[PDB]
Symmetry: C2
Subunit: 94 residues, 2 copies
């Protein structure tokens, strides 16, 4: 009975100067995720494993497989697009 129905942000316009920073943003978010997991005793492991608290994405961001990095940049951008869709201006300062 559950069907995800995310909002259509395909036409939201973000500043190019911000999209260029996608990678910074995804990186910080990954760092926060990994500090949280690591604080709860998680460590790096080749195979994901709930019992030994093993996760393969517990590596520096640069070392993530490219599709995981795509995922993270895209997530970052969805979130920000959602903020622009809810009626906020986003502009680079001077």
């Amino acid at each position: 009975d559950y069907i995800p129905e995310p909002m259509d942000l395909s036409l939201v316009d973000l500043p190019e100067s911000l999209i260029q920073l996608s990678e910074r943003i995804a990186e910080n978010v990954h760092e926060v995720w990994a500090k949280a997991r690591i604080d709860e005793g998680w460590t790096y492991g080749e195979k994901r494993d709930d019992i030994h608290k093993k996760h393969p994405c517990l590596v520096p961001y640069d070392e993530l497989p490219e599709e995981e990095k795509e995922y993270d940049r895209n997530t970052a951008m969805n979130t920000i697009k959602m903020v622009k869709k809810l009626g906020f201006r986003i502009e680079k300062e001077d």
Copy 2:
């Protein structure tokens, strides 16, 4: 050898009107995640299971346990704070 060191955003100031919308944002972000998973064959299961592609968070956002929603909202706000920290202004139109 790997130590995560996220940036300190504790002192970044967001409009209150935006923080009030945390739940809308986190929800939509949950929908995007759940649609991607479900498209790759994942379904709801009370225990997480990579073989049968089972995940207990594949439920409507409202049904998520409160600590999971907490996590989702905080993540949403981290991301937006990081934009403000990188030199962008964010203001209600």
